[PDB]
Amino acid sequence: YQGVNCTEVSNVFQTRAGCLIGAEYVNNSYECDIPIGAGICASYQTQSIIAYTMSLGAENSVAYS
Amino acid sequence: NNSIAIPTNFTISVTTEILPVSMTKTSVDCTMYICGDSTECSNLLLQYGSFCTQLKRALTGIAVEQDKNTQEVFAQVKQIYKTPPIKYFGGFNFSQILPDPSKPSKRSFIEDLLFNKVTLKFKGLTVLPPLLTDEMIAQYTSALLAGTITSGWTFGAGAALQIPFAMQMAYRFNGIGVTQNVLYENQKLIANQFNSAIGKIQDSLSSTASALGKLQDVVNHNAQALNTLVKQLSSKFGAISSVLNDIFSRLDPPEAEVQIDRLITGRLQSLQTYVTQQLIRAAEIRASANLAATKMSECVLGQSKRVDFCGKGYHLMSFPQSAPHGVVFLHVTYVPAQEKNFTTAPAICHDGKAHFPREGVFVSNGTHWFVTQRNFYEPQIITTDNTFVSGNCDVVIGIVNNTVYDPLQPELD
Amino acid sequence: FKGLTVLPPLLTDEMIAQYTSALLAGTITSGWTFGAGAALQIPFAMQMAYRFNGIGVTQNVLYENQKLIANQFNSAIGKIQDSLSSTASALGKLQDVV
Amino acid sequence: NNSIAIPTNFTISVTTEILPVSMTKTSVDCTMYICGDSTECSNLLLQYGSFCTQLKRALTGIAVEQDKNTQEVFAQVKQIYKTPPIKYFGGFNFSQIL
Amino acid sequence: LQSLQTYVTQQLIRAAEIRASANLAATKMSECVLGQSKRVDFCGKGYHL
Amino acid sequence: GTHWFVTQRNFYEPQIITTDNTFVSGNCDVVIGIVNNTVYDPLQPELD
């Protein structure tokens, strides 16, 4: 529900884009499958619908001397 | 006839470029705009066909295109490179472009000024949030800066390979046609000039009134389009009243049907005009975003030989910075200065043979001929190592007489 | 009329011709130097030798075939006039715009 | 797999490229075109809203765009360079272009 | 009003096309007149001088 | 047909094969199609 603070009208999660119902939030970061908005994407767990924050890429550090 | 000017010094400079990348994402519902809270009109609105589906499809397409543009411009790098804790790079100071260690917003100070300088659920009208937040775009920019500072151009064409920044600058001077010893004997001066230029850009961005007008233009265009779309809802369009409830109250349904049709036609025409203008503006913004992505690749990840693509002067390197609806490029270039006049010749006639310079030009100092590079005055004795011989002295027009030193000549024994 | 008018352009044709003359003079007299900083003079023969070095041909080729190269350039420039004059659709794009 | 071809001569050629840069700047009058300078129609026309402001804004933007196009294409040179009075450039004929 | 709106829309599309052509012409000026171009067939057929 | 020279790619300007216009890289049994010829050393006749 875009633009609705769903404290008004299974898992219920609140996003800057809206309120998301039927998707479980997980703290792992994956590549974006279905873009929802405001940096949050959703995908099929493979099993259930999950929501997460997309990862930009792998972290790397170059040994500068 | 035989006059040439060669610069004896140089001034490295930094310039700023601003490019819009994307615009706001807007969604429109017909019924609420055309005639809301009135199911009587909602019954008649369905009679016109599939205009709403077309309008929604167009708006959704031009909304997805914005995320496509942002991803194309900023997601050039595959890995998030990190800068070393020791911020010493041979005298060059990057504090104004690297992220702030105090971590107020993980933004550079110039990025802070860019975000502060430019300004950034209606009656049926909504706006959608972009997929990438400002923090993620700033993180992408930080990764690009770390990669381009630590490794050079190598990170953009394969595996990232570290190299000291002084040797990278020597590479780039070799690229612009100047020998590396010019950097190695003027490293301190070049570092001082670079720091001063960065400070001057800092001040110029802080002080200029209309430096970022290219993004204010987009923001104001969107605002005026939305405002005029809302304002058009109060027009009569030939009916007795602009209030649908009023025309229902004051007239019979058979006669009120014509006025309802007039209102429907006017509002549909206004909304279609809005959609068409949005499509044209989206095409323009897509062209700008393609230009920005091309500039990112060419100037940031490499060293372009194109003349004015990455700033005036001979291009050395560029640094990207983030803006609320665009990207900012800081082009570091090489500008010659303090030129002097000499008299020149095309070839040297020695022993009945014509000698041509290998990678330089002949200059005479008035009475003593030397060989020097074109972009910097550095005379040297003419020998057989820096010249090649081809032909006689009778074919070249303007040949001059001089002796060519032989390095192996003194070894007579 | 019926309310439909045409506005004059800001730059007259004389000003555009002046800009073009400035560009031609700069490129003839200083090479590509005038487009990257201070304009530095250089004889045209040496500039064209540099431009041959830029395409992978040594400069002694020009310094030995200067007269032939000049004659070929002159003939091509002379033929451009007749090529533009005789063709009936050389400037088709601007006519299409108008 | 053991044969090559190497040119022994060369020809220099001149070709022309034509590119439109700008188009005509036009203006419109709502009342004159639509109502035909009739007073009865003008009072009814203002009842239709702000379409005329939109059209005027669009055409003004187009005109400014044309001016910007011309300035961008032709005004790239900072200074007005002048050719030397003695027009000898080592055998070349630039009279057709000067 | 419909006729005038159609005219304005066509003018906007043509203006966008002319802007693209003008950008191309400016790039051609900068890369072919103010320098020597190594891009193939960008400043004519052959090795650009 | 009988002798070997070195020419620039875009123009026919034959030159005698010397040590100035050639560089040595390894032994001559790895390159496919390598032929037999002499290389002229300008230093030896001078005998510095």
Ligand SMILES: *[C@@H]1O[C@H](CO)[C@@H](O[C@@H]2O[C@H](CO)[C@@H](O)[C@H](O)[C@H]2NC(C)=O)[C@H](O)[C@H]1NC(C)=O
């Ligand atoms: C290379 O080509 C040029 C161009 O055809 C030749 O120059 C011509 O030579 C003939 C015969 O000497 C003259 O009649 C023409 O007037 C020349 N043309 C020009 C434009 O001057 C040149 O001889 C050729 N050189 C070689 C080695 O083949």
Ligand SMILES: *[C@@H]1O[C@H](CO)[C@@H](O)[C@H](O)[C@H]1NC(C)=O
């Ligand atoms: C929704 O309301 C709660 C409580 O009023 C608030 O904390 C939260 O920030 C709101 N969500 C948004 C997206 O504003």
Ligand SMILES: *[C@@H]1O[C@H](CO)[C@@H](O)[C@H](O)[C@H]1NC(C)=O
């Ligand atoms: C994700 O982290 C939040 C914050 O602690 C926590 O409340 C939530 O249970 C976590 N969810 C999962 C699937 O780990």
Ligand SMILES: *[C@@H]1O[C@H](CO)[C@@H](O)[C@H](O)[C@H]1NC(C)=O
């Ligand atoms: C002009 O200078 C060129 C370059 O040295 C020379 O070849 C030519 O003969 C000169 N002409 C005159 C008239 O001095």
Ligand SMILES: *[C@@H]1O[C@H](CO)[C@@H](O)[C@H](O)[C@H]1NC(C)=O
């Ligand atoms: C880099 O510049 C900033 C601001 O000019 C200055 O505070 C800082 O000390 C400089 N870095 C070093 C290592 O001096």
Ligand SMILES: *[C@@H]1O[C@H](CO)[C@@H](O)[C@H](O)[C@H]1NC(C)=O
């Ligand atoms: C060129 O520089 C020299 C200084 O060596 C000066 O004497 C001469 O007048 C200058 N010529 C021009 C045309 O500037």
Ligand SMILES: *[C@@H]1O[C@H](CO)[C@@H](O)[C@H](O)[C@H]1NC(C)=O
């Ligand atoms: C260069 O010219 C100056 C002035 O003509 C002269 O004093 C100097 O000796 C010259 N350079 C050399 C290496 O002779």
Ligand SMILES: *[C@@H]1O[C@H](CO)[C@@H](O)[C@H](O)[C@H]1NC(C)=O
């Ligand atoms: C150069 O010297 C030779 C003799 O070694 C002479 O014949 C020739 O005329 C000289 N060139 C000039 C331009 O004086």
Ligand SMILES: *[C@@H]1O[C@H](CO)[C@@H](O)[C@H](O)[C@H]1NC(C)=O
């Ligand atoms: C060259 O081509 C011919 C014809 O296919 C072939 O027989 C010969 O082996 C080739 N030479 C080499 C060195 O591959």
Ligand SMILES: *[C@@H]1O[C@H](CO)[C@@H](O)[C@H](O)[C@H]1NC(C)=O
């Ligand atoms: C160069 O060509 C032009 C064009 O025909 C000609 O008028 C001029 O006389 C030529 N230059 C000389 C010095 O003859």
Ligand SMILES: *[C@@H]1O[C@H](CO)[C@@H](O)[C@H](O)[C@H]1NC(C)=O
């Ligand atoms: C080249 O010469 C070497 C020794 O001089 C000889 O062993 C070899 O067979 C020769 N190669 C050919 C193809 O004749």
